[PDB]
Amino acid sequence: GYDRHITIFSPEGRLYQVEYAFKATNQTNINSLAVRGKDCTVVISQKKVPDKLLDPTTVSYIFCISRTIGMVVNGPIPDARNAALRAKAEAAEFRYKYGYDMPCDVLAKRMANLSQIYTQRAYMRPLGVILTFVSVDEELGPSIYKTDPAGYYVGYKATATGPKQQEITTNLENHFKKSKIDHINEESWEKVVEFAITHMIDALGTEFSKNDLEVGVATKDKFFTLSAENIEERLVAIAEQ
Amino acid sequence: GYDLSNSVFSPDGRNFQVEYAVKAVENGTTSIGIKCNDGVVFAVEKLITSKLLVPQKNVKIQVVDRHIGCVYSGLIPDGRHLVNRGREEAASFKKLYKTPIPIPAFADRLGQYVQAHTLYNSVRPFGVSTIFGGVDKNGAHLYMLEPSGSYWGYKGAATGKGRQSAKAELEKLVDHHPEGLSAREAVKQAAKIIYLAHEDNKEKDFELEISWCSLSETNGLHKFVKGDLLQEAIDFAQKEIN
Amino acid sequence: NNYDGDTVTFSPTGRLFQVEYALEAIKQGSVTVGLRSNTHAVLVALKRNADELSSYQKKIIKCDEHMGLSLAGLAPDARVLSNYLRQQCNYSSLVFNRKLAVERAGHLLCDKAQKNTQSYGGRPYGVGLLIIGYDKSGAHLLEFQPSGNVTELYGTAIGARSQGAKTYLERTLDTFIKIDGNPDELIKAGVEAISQSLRDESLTVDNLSIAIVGKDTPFTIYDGEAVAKYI
Amino acid sequence: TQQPIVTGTSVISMKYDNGVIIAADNLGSYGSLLRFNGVERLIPVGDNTVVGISGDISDMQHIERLLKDLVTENAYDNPLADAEEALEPSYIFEYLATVMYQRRSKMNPLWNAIIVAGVQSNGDQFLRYVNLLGVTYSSPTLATGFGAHMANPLLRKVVDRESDIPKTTVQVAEEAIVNAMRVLYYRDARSSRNFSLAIIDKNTGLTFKKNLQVENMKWDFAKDIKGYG
Amino acid sequence: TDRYSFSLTTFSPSGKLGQIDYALTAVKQGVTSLGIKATNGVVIATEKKSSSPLAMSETLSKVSLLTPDIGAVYSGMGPDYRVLVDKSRKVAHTSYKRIYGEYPPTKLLVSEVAKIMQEATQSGGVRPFGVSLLIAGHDEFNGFSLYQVDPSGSYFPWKATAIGKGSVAAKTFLEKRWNDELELEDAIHIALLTLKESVEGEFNGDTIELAIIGDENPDLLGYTGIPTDKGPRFRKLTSQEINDRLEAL
Amino acid sequence: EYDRGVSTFSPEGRLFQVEYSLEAIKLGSTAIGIATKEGVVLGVEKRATSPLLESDSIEKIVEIDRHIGCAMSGLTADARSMIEHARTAAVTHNLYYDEDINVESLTQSVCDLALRFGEGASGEERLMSRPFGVALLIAGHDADDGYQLFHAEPSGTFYRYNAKAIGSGSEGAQAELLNEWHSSLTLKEAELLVLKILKQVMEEKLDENNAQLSCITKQDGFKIYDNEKTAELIKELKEKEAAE
Amino acid sequence: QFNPYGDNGGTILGIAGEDFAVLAGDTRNITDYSINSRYEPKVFDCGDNIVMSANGFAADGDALVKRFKNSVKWYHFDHNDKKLSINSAARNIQHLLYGKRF
Amino acid sequence: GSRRYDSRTTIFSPEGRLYQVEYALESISHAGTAIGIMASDGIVLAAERKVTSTLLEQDTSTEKLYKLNDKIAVAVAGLTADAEILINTARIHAQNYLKTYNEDIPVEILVRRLSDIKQGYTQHGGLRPFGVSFIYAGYDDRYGYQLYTSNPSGNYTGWKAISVGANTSAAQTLLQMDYKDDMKVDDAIELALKTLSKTTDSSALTYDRLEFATIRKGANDGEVYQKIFKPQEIKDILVKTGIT
Amino acid sequence: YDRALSIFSPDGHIFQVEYALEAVKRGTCAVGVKGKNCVVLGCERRSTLKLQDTRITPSKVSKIDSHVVLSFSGLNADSRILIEKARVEAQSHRLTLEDPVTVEYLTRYVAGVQQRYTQSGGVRPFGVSTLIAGFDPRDDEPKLYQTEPSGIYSSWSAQTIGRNSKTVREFLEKNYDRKEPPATVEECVKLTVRSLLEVVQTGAKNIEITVVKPDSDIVALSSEEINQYVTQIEQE
C-alpha cells in the first residue's frame, strides 16, 4: 500500500516512512561516543577520509550551535547541515528574546517538535540524521541529549551512535555498573578523553589515529574542538597508563 | 515504488531520485579543480558538436562575487539557475556586512539551497555538480557540490565523464608535490589532465578553457586565462599526449 | 506514467522527459534558419498558411530596432517569451540608457524557463527561438533550446529538417563571414540554406520572409514583392 | 521624510579638450561644527569614471553599495560582458538616477547631488548632473551644493559656450580648478582645508592626486583695517 | 507548489472514517497509562519506556503540565504528543490568559484541544495524531473532572479509565476496585496496581511516573503570604516516594 | 494518462487536451464567415434541437464593439467567458487611447486568455487547468489593414482567413469555400454565399427561424440583420439554383 | 522636512500650422535666481513625428518623456507597427499624468 | 508527485452522486439513534449514545445534547467528534444575529448556514464532509416551532417527527403509526421513549444511556424554556413510562 | 489546492459536466410553460413520505425579484448556493445601475457561475439546471429561458428538465404551439399541472404552481388550490 510512502498510519498504527529514516545513518559508517566526565562532556567520533584527494581538515561532523553546546551528527551530511542551521537559528532566537543562552534541554525539545512537524506533512521527508547535543549547563550540569528523526528525545547518561553502536553501549553500561554513578570520575578532562578512546577501541576492535578521530570537549561555559595534534598527544598517554 | 518522488524513502536507506541526479552530471563535461597554496585553478572541457560554434563564447565559467569562480557540468540550464541564485546571495551579504562574502560562507549557502528541492515534491532537484573556490583571509579553498547537497574539502576534484581519468592524475600530482604547488604552474597541469580526460571523449573533439583565482598573480580576484599564457598551456598538453 | 506524468520527477538518466517531448514540437513545427556575418545578422523564415484561403503566418517578431526573435514551435508558448524579452529590453533602455546585449537577454530567458519547469504543474516551453541582434559586440546569433540553454554560433537552424541546413552553413561558413558590409549576400546564402529543408513546402515570394539588422540598418522585416530581390 | 543630518560640501568640475577634471574636499559637517574631517567623497569606477557625490553622507553610503553592485551585475554572465559590453559614464548615470527617483516616490529619498564625470570609448567628454529630485542637466562647467553659484562661476568664466571646449587645455583648466576650490574654502563656512583632486584623461587613464592643501591664499589685507568701521 | 490541500482523512466504502481508526490502533501499540478519579483528587500514572539502557528517564516527560491545576498524560506515539502538548498550552494561553485572564475550567480546555484534533482531520498535508490523552483536572466550578480526548476529536468524561495496549484488561480490573467514594491515597494504590498488570517489564518507582492532581501545595507556586491564592494542585511525586508507594499496594 | 495531467507531454510531442479541444468544434452549430472589401459577413446556425424551441432570441452573434463583431461555434459555455474578456479588451483600448482597436490585436488579446493551461508555471494568475473547446470567427474592420476576418483557436493561435467555416460541417463547407471564393464578390454575393453553403449542412430547413445574418461594415457599423432581410435573401437564393 | 517640488523654469511655445507644426523652447535651466546651465534643450523628438516637451520642473519633465517613449515602442510592438496619432498620443499622456495625482 | 497520491475522492459518480456523501450515510447508521418529535406544546429531543462502557460516566455526559442558543438545541447522531466543529460554528452564527439585529436567529437561517458548509466541502478544496446528521429543535416567531433534519450532503427537510442514526427504518414506521397532531409534551415524552426501546443497541434501554431534553412552552408568558434533564430525573421519567 | 477535478475527456467532453447532467436527470423535475401574459414554473416538491410540513421543506421555486423567479432541476443541495448568489447579483444591479432586473440579465449571471468551476481546477461545478423566467420591466412580453450546468443558456417557449423529460416533452408537442402561447393564465397553469401529473404523480401533493403576471404580480398557489383544477382536468 501507500501508507508506507507518505506519513499516514497503517492498520497497526505505524508510520513506516518514518522508520526508514533511522535506517540511513548506517550508510556513512560513522560512530560516535559521548560520555559525561566530572566537569566536562567529551564526544569522540570517527572521521572517514577515504582518499588523499579529500582534505582531512574540512571533513567535520562537529557543528557548534552555541558557544557552549556542541553537536555531533551521525548520518547523511546534507541533512546534517540542514539540521545544524535550524538549531543555530533557534538558539540565537532564544538568546535574543529571553536574555540568556538557550538551554540544551530546551533545544533538544525544539528539534523534536520540528522533527514531528516534518512527519506531519505528507510531502515532507524526515531529516534522517541522528543528532547528539553535548553540553555542560549551569542548571542541569553535564548533559547529553540525543534527538532522532521521529521527534522523540530523552536525556542521556552516555550514548553511542553508528552501525556498530551496540558494542559500544555494552561497554559503557558495564562501566557505570561498577562505578555506580552516572558520570566518570577523574579530575582532568584530558584523562576522560583518554578513557573514552580506550572504550571505543575495545568496542569497534580497531585502534584509531589522529585523523580517524575528531574530538570535541565541552567544559564550563565553553565548547571547543581538539586539533589533530592534540589527539596524537592522547594516544601517547594510552601508553602511559 | 520509491521512484516516483523525492520524499519516498526506501527500506534500504537510499533515496534514488537523488542518487540518479548524480548520473546527470556523469553525462556532462569533464571539469577539474586543482587546490593550490595561493589559489585554485579550474579547467573545463567544452565539447565541440560541429564547427559552426564560436569557441570561447559559450560560457560555463561564471564569476560569483568579484573573487569566487564557479564552473559547472551536467544539465546546463539547471546549472545556470543555480549560479543565478548565488549571485543574489553575494549581493545580500555585501549589503548587510559591507564586505564580499567568504569562500566557506558561499559554500554553506549553496548546500542549503540544493537541500531544499529534494525535500518537496513540488520543486525539482538540480542536475549539476559545481566546482568553485577562491582566496579569502582564511586561505585558498576548493569545493565540489553534488546535486544531493554534499560538499567537502578537496585537495583536487573532478567530475564529468572523465572524472576517473582526471582523479588518477591528481593522486600522482600530490606525490610530485606533497607540499602542494603554485597556482602559476598549475595552469599547465590543468590543461594536461583535461587532455587525459579527453581519452574518454576520444570520439569527439574539444575546446579547452581555463580560469584561475590566485593571490600571487591576479591579486586574489577570479579572472580568465587567455592570450599568450593560454596558448602555452595548449601547446604543453598537446606535446605530452602526442 | 511514472516520470512522464510529472514535471518534478527524475530520471536516473539525468533527464526530464518532458523536455524531449517539448523538443518534438520542433520536428512537427515550422523551420527557420539564421546566419550572421560580423556586421549584419539575418533570419530567413518559412511562412506557412493554414490553407490556401489563408494569409501565411508571420514567424518573426520584432523585439526592438536592435533585436528580433523567431519561433519554430508552438505559438502560445512563444507569446510568453516575446512579451518577456520586450519587457527586459525596454527596461534596459529606461534604467541603464543602453541597448540590451544579445548574450545577456538569452541568459535572462534561460533562467526564466527553468523556474517554470521547476514548479510542479508547470510546463517546459516547446518553442525554440533564434535570437538575433546587433549590439556593441557586433552581431550575435543565439540558438535557444527547449531546455533553455543558449548557444552562440555564426549560423544555425532549428525546425523540421534543420540538419541539412547546418550542413549547408558549415560548408559556406568561411564564405559568409569574410563578406562584410553587404547584407545582400547573406540573404541569398540563407535562401539556399533553407532550401536544404524543403519537403515540397516550396519557397515563393509570399512564403519567404526575411529580417535583418545592421549597424546602419534598423531591424527590418522584408515581405511581399520585396523578398523577390533575393530570388 | 529625511532632512540634512551630516552633510558634505561641494564638487567642482570642468572639461578640457582631452578629458575632464573633478575635485572635492573631505568633509562631513554637522552644521557650523565640522564634525568629521577626512571623509572621502571622490569614488572611482574604473579608470574611465570618477563620481563626485555631494549632499548627505548617510545617503552617500547607500550609493557606494549601489556602485559596487552595478559593477558586479554588469560583470555577471559573460567574461566578455565588461570588456565590450564595457560600462560608459552614461550607463552609470542612468542607473543611479532612475533608482533614486523611485526611492523619492516612497517619500524617503537618496538625498544627494552627484556629478558623473568620465570619458567615452570614443573619447567624448561626459559631464552630467543628477540629484535626489531627479533634476538633470549638462554644462561645460558644473558644481553641486553652495558651489553651484559660488565656485562654478569662475570656471564658467573661461568657457562661455561649448564650441569653446577644444580651446581649453589641461593646464588652463588645472589652474582654474585649484583656484575655484580656494574660492569655495574662502567664502563657505562648511568646507575643509583638506581637498582631494582627480583627473580623468583619455590619454593616460585616471591620475589621482590626493590630499592637496588649499594654498596661495591671500591674507595680507587682513591687517590694514582697525575696527569694524 | 501546494497541491496537498485534499484531506488525508476519508471514509471507507463500509462507512467509518478509516484514518482515525488507524490512528486509534497506534494507541494499542502505545504505552499504558491510566487515570482513576477520586472524590477528593485525581491520579494519573504512566510507565516510562526507552530504547536504550543508557537513556535518561529523568529528562523524559510523559506526564506534563498544561496549567497549575490541570495535567495531561498520553498513550500512543511519543512524537505526536510532543508537538500536541505545546499546541494545547498555546491555545490555552492565547484564548484564556489574554482574553479571560485566569486558568480555564477543565471542561473548557478539553473542548478546545479536541478542536485541534478535528482540524488535523480537515485539510490536506495533515493526517491526525495517533495518541489518546487523559486530561485530569480540577476547577472550582464543575469540581474534579477526568476527561479522555480521542484521536477522533471527541471527549468523554470517565469515572476511571485506561488507554494504551492494556486498556481492555484495565477497565475490567477497575470494575471491582472502583467505588463512588474514594480517598486520594487509596486511588494511588488502585492506579499503580492496575498498571503493574499492564507492564511486562520490571515495575519500579524509578521507571514509573506518578502524578496527582490532588491536594494543593502552596510552596510550589513560588510565593507565600496570600492564602486566598494557591499553588499547583498538580504535584509530581519524586522517585523515592513512589518506592514507598510500591509497598502500599 | 497524459490527459489526466494538466500540462504534460505526450510522446507525440504536443499536448493532448488541446487535441480533444479541436474535436469539440464538432459539437457546435455552424458558423460561416466570408470576407470581402465591402464588409465582412458572419452568418450563424441557431439549430432547433426541439420543436418547442424558441429560436428568435438565441443569438450566437455577439458584439465586441461597434467596429468589431464576432460569431462563436463549438461548445458555447466556454465562449461566454471569452466574450466578456474580449469586450473589456476593446473598451480598454478606447479608454487608453480614444482610438479604434485593430481586429488582429483584439483577437490576440483573446488568444492570451486561451493561454492559461498549466498551474504553477508562468507568473500570471492561473484560472483554469485546461484549454477551451470553442472556436471564434472574429470579423471586423480596422482603418489600417481595411476589412479583416480572423479565426481564433482554443490553442491560443490565430490566423487571418479570407473565408473560414467552422462547426460540425466545417470540412464539407470548407471544400466548397475553396472553389467558390473569389475577389469579385461583393457584400451581397458574399451574403448569398453564406446561405448557399449553410443550406447544405442544415439538417432541417433553411429559413429565418434558425439562421441569423450579421454584417460588420465601416460605413454603417455593426448591424445585426432582422429576420425580414434574412428571409428575402433566402428567396433570392432559390432563383440561382433554378438558373443552373 | 522634505518638499519634493521646485521650479526649474524654462518656457515653451507650440504653434499649429497648416501642414506644419512648430514646437520651440529655450535651453536655459535655472533653480531660483541661479542659472544652473546655459545649455540644456528641452524639446525631444519621440519618433514618428511627435515632438514632446514637458516643461517646468525638470525631474517630472524628464520622467514623462521617458515613459511616453516606452509607450511608443509598445505601440509598434503590439499593434504590428501601428502609426501613432497625435491624438492617440494625447490620451496616453493624460493617463501618465493622472496616474500620479496623489 | 502530488497528483500521484490523489485518486480523486470528491468528484461525482456516474449516477451524479458524491462518493464521500454516500459513504457518510452508512457511517451515521453505525452511530446511535436520535429521535425528534414535535408536539403542539413543544419539541422533544431524545438521543441514545453510541458508546456505553464498563465504567463510562454517562451521568454528566453532555456529549449528544448541546444548546446552540437559549431557544435552539440539537440532538446529534453520527460522529460526536465530527459534529463538534459545526456545533460551535452554529453558536457563533446565532450570537452574530443577536449582536447585529437585536433578535434571536430563526431556525431556518441557522440550519441553512450549516448545510452550506457541508456543501462547501465537496464543492472546493478536496476536503471530505463531516459524517453527521442533526435533528434541530428550534423556536422562531415566524413558523413557530420548527423541526429539521440535515444530512452530510448539505440539504434540509422539514418533518413532524423523524429519526436518525441506527435503525431508522423501524423507528420511522412506528412513529408514523402512533403519532397524532394533537399530542402534547406529555404524550411525546412517552412516545419517544417507546420508539427508542425498539431500536436500542443493547437489549434494554437504561436511564444512563438516555439523554433526554425538551423545549416547553409551559414556561410563563409563552416563553420557551429548554431543559436538559438531570440523570435522576431521566430515571424518574423512565419508570413512569414503564420501560424499567 | 489546484489539482484539477476538471480534466479533458477523450470525447471532447469534461467528466464533471457529464456528471452534472446525470445529476440533473436523477433529481427533481421542473416544467416551464409561458403564456402571452404569464410564466408558470412548476417543480417537483419532495414530500412523498407521510406527515411532513411543506412550509419548511426546501423551496423549489425562489423569487429573486418582484417579477423574476428561479426554479431548478437536479440536486437539492447544490441548488441553494445558486439561489443565494442570484439574489445578491439582483440586488447589486438595483443598487449600482438601477432598474429592477431583467430576466436575461439573471440568465447570463447563472450561466456565468457554471463556467468558473468547470474551467478552473480544484473545484467542481454545480449539478443544477435552472428555469429562469419572468419579465423585463416596461415590457409586457414574458420570457422563458433554461440554463444547464454546462454554462449554456437557450431560450424556449415550453421546456422541461429533470427525470423523464422525454415523456413530458412528447405530451407538450400536440397540446402546445411554438408560435401561439396560451392567451389565458388559467390555461397555462392547467397545462403545467397536466405535465407534472405524468412523472411526479400522487395527486397535487407534490405539485407546485408559481404564477408571475406583469405589473410585478407574484403569487404562490398552495396545493389545495391546485386540487380544484385537477378535478376539472380529469372530468374533461
Swiss-Prot record, chain A:
The 26S proteasome consists of a 20S proteasome core and two 19S regulatory subunits. The 20S proteasome core is composed of 28 subunits that are arranged in four stacked rings, resulting in a barrel-shaped structure. The two end rings are each formed by seven alpha subunits, and the two central rings are each formed by seven beta subunits. The catalytic chamber with the active sites is on the inside of the barrel. Interacts with CIC1. The lineage of its organism: Eukaryota, Fungi, Dikarya, Ascomycota, Saccharomycotina. The keyword Nucleus applies. The keyword Acetylation applies. Present with 15200 molecules/cell in log phase SD medium. The proteasome degrades poly-ubiquitinated proteins in the cytoplasm and in the nucleus. It is essential for the regulated turnover of proteins and for the removal of misfolded proteins. The proteasome is a multicatalytic proteinase complex that is characterized by its ability to cleave peptides with Arg, Phe, Tyr, Leu, and Glu adjacent to the leaving group at neutral or slightly basic pH. It has an ATP-dependent proteolytic activity. This is Proteasome subunit alpha type-1. PANTHER family: PROTEASOME SUBUNIT ALPHA/BETA. It comes from the Eukaryota. There is a cross-link at residue 222 (Glycyl lysine isopeptide (Lys-Gly) (interchain with G-Cter in ubiquitin)). It comes from Saccharomyces cerevisiae (strain ATCC 204508 / S288c) (Baker's yeast).
UniProtKB/Swiss-Prot annotation, chain C:
One of its GO terms (cellular component) is proteasome complex. The 26S proteasome consists of a 20S proteasome core and two 19S regulatory subunits. The 20S proteasome core is composed of 28 subunits that are arranged in four stacked rings, resulting in a barrel-shaped structure. The two end rings are each formed by seven alpha subunits, and the two central rings are each formed by seven beta subunits. The catalytic chamber with the active sites is on the inside of the barrel. The modification Phosphoserine is found at residue 11. Pfam families: Proteasome, Proteasome_A_N. InterPro entries: Ntn_hydrolases_N, Proteasome_alpha, Proteasome_alpha-type, Proteasome_asu_N, Proteasome_sua/b. It comes from Saccharomyces cerevisiae (strain ATCC 204508 / S288c) (Baker's yeast). There is a cross-link at residue 188 (Glycyl lysine isopeptide (Lys-Gly) (interchain with G-Cter in ubiquitin)). The keyword tRNA-binding does not apply. Its main location: cytoplasm. PROSITE patterns: PROTEASOME_ALPHA_1, PROTEASOME_ALPHA_2. The gene is PRE5. This is Proteasome subunit alpha type-6. It comes from the Eukaryota. Present with 7210 molecules/cell in log phase SD medium. One of its GO terms (biological process) is proteasomal ubiquitin-independent protein catabolic process. Belongs to the peptidase T1A family. Keywords: Cytoplasm, Isopeptide bond, Nucleus, Phosphoprotein, Proteasome, Ubl conjugation. It is found in: Cytoplasm; Nucleus.
Curated annotation (Swiss-Prot), chain D:
InterPro entries: Ntn_hydrolases_N, Proteasome_beta4, Proteasome_bsu_CS, Proteasome_sua/b, Proteasome_suB-type. The keyword Cytoplasm applies. Gene3D superfamilies: Glutamine Phosphoribosylpyrophosphate, subunit 1, domain 1 (3.60.20.10). The keyword Zinc-finger does not apply. Keywords: Cytoplasm, Nucleus, Proteasome. One of its GO terms (cellular component) is cytosol. One of its GO terms (biological process) is proteasome-mediated ubiquitin-dependent protein catabolic process. It comes from the Eukaryota. It holds the Pfam family Proteasome. It is found in: Cytoplasm; Nucleus. PROSITE patterns: PROTEASOME_BETA_1 (PS00854), PROTEASOME_BETA_2 (PS51476). Non-catalytic component of the proteasome which degrades poly-ubiquitinated proteins in the cytoplasm and in the nucleus. It is essential for the regulated turnover of proteins and for the removal of misfolded proteins. The proteasome is a multicatalytic proteinase complex that is characterized by its ability to cleave peptides with Arg, Phe, Tyr, Leu, and Glu adjacent to the leaving group at neutral or slightly basic pH. It has an ATP-dependent proteolytic activity. PRE3 and PRE4 are necessary for the peptidyl-glutamyl-peptide-hydrolyzing activity. Belongs to the peptidase T1B family. Present with 16900 molecules/cell in log phase SD medium. This is Proteasome subunit beta type-7. It comes from Saccharomyces cerevisiae (strain ATCC 204508 / S288c).
Swiss-Prot record, chain F:
InterPro entries: Ntn_hydrolases_N, Proteasome_alpha, Proteasome_alpha-type, Proteasome_alpha_type_5, Proteasome_asu_N, Proteasome_sua/b. Gene3D superfamilies: Glutamine Phosphoribosylpyrophosphate, subunit 1, domain 1. Pfam families: Proteasome, Proteasome_A_N. Keywords: Cytoplasm, Nucleus, Phosphoprotein, Proteasome. It comes from the Eukaryota. Changing residue 43 to D: In DOA5-1; slight decrease in activity. It is found in: Cytoplasm; Nucleus. The modification Phosphothreonine is found at residue 49. Transmembrane segments: none annotated. GO terms for cellular component: nucleus; proteasome complex; proteasome core complex, alpha-subunit complex; proteasome storage granule. GO terms for biological process: proteasomal ubiquitin-independent protein catabolic process; proteasome-mediated ubiquitin-dependent protein catabolic process. The modification Phosphoserine is found at residue 50. Present with 17100 molecules/cell in log phase SD medium. The proteasome degrades poly-ubiquitinated proteins in the cytoplasm and in the nucleus. It is essential for the regulated turnover of proteins and for the removal of misfolded proteins. The proteasome is a multicatalytic proteinase complex that is characterized by its ability to cleave peptides with Arg, Phe, Tyr, Leu, and Glu adjacent to the leaving group at neutral or slightly basic pH. It has an ATP-dependent proteolytic activity. Belongs to the peptidase T1A family. This is Proteasome subunit alpha type-5.
